[PDB]
Structure 1
Amino acid sequence: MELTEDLNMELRVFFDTNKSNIKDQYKPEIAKVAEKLSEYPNATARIEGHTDNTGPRKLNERLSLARANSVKSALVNEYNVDASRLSTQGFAWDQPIADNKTKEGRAMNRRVFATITGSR
């Protein structure tokens, strides 16, 4: 007998300008991700952070990575997920998903998108 269940999950977290903290509104989503990572012990997560295009380049390279690491930290420290199962990478303002010329668009760009995949 061959039995496989494949998990596919996408997480989206947004941040305030120049901030890398996890706003309470996203805790329920992060909790759901931790739950599935427990339900699928072999699953891994690709966490990628981003920034809008305002401010010094290096500040944003660092900030984008800090955002991705903030999500990883929440999973690792609050939910005890094995750190090695999660990758983090920052892309500064290089991959926008919205218009940087508006407040709303910049808000969409200050984000962390994570893809969780794996089978059991």
Structure 2
Amino acid sequence: GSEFEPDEKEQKQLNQYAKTILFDTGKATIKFQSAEVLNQIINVLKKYPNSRFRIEGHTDSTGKKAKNMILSQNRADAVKVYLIQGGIDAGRLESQGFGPEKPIASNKNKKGRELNRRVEINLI
């Protein structure tokens, strides 16, 4: 569209979509329920064909950190590969796992850890 990059509201909405991307515990496979929202994310990304995005994988702090790193990276890669197969230019996308390194809430209860478990898709 007429905007090179998504505005702040659009960026927020993008991550609201991305937080609904769910994985089974200890797994990095895209579940089918994520298909629709990923297809919608593809729709949004296609409106900004020259903007670049970092797909981020985040876990809660439970379990060993090194395993969380690998898992979060592999979930981010799974999301990127899906987006690429869905028509997004590969050169536009980076994928990076952060493990438990970037919490947005406390890891001391279920509510906070649920917030910490997320995929983000951030404008670069």
TM-score (norm 2): 0.76
Give the AA of the match of 1:71.
V
Quote how far apart the aligned CAs of 1:116 are.
Answer: 4.4
Distance 1:109 1:15 in 2: 13
Deviation at 1:74, TM superposition (A): 1.1
Taking the TM superposition and a 5 Å limit, the aligned residue runs for 1:29-48 are 29-48=37-56
Report the Cα distance in structure 1 between the residues aligned to 2:35 and 2:105, rounded to whole angstroms: 24
Report if aligned partners of 1:67, 1:111 keep a CA contact under 8 Å in 2. no
Q: Which runs of 4+ in 1 moved over 4 A?
A: none
- Residues 1:98 and 1:21: Cα distance change in structure 2 (over 3 Å): farther
Between 22-31 and 82-91, the greater mean CA deviation after superposition: 22-31
Q: Which residue of 2 aligns with 1:94?
A: 101
- Partners of 2:55 and 2:80 lie apart in 1 by 8
Unpaired runs of at least 5, structure 1: none
| Aligned mates of 1:104, 1:41 — CA distance in 2 | 36
> Which stretch has the larger CA shift, 30-39 or 83-92?
30-39
Contact 1:45 1:115 in 2 (8 A): yes
Give the length in aligned residue pairs: 114
Structure 1 Cα separation of the partners of residues 29 and 110 of structure 2: 19
**Largest Rg, 1 or 2:** 1
Task: Identify the residue that residue 75 of structure 2 maps to in structure 1.
Answer: 67
Percent identity over the alignment is: 42
Which residues of 2 match residues 79-118 of structure 1 at below 5 A? 79-116=86-123
**Matches of 2:37 and 2:103, distance apart in 1:** 22
TM-score by length of 1: 0.78
TM superposition shift of 1:14 = 3.8
Q: Which has the higher strand share?
A: 1
Stretches of structure 2 lacking an aligned partner (at least 5 in a row): none
Report the aligned-residue RMSD. 2.2
Give 3-state SS (helix, strand or coil) of 2:46's partner. Answer: helix
Structure (1/2) with the larger helix percentage: 2
SS state at 2:120 partner? strand
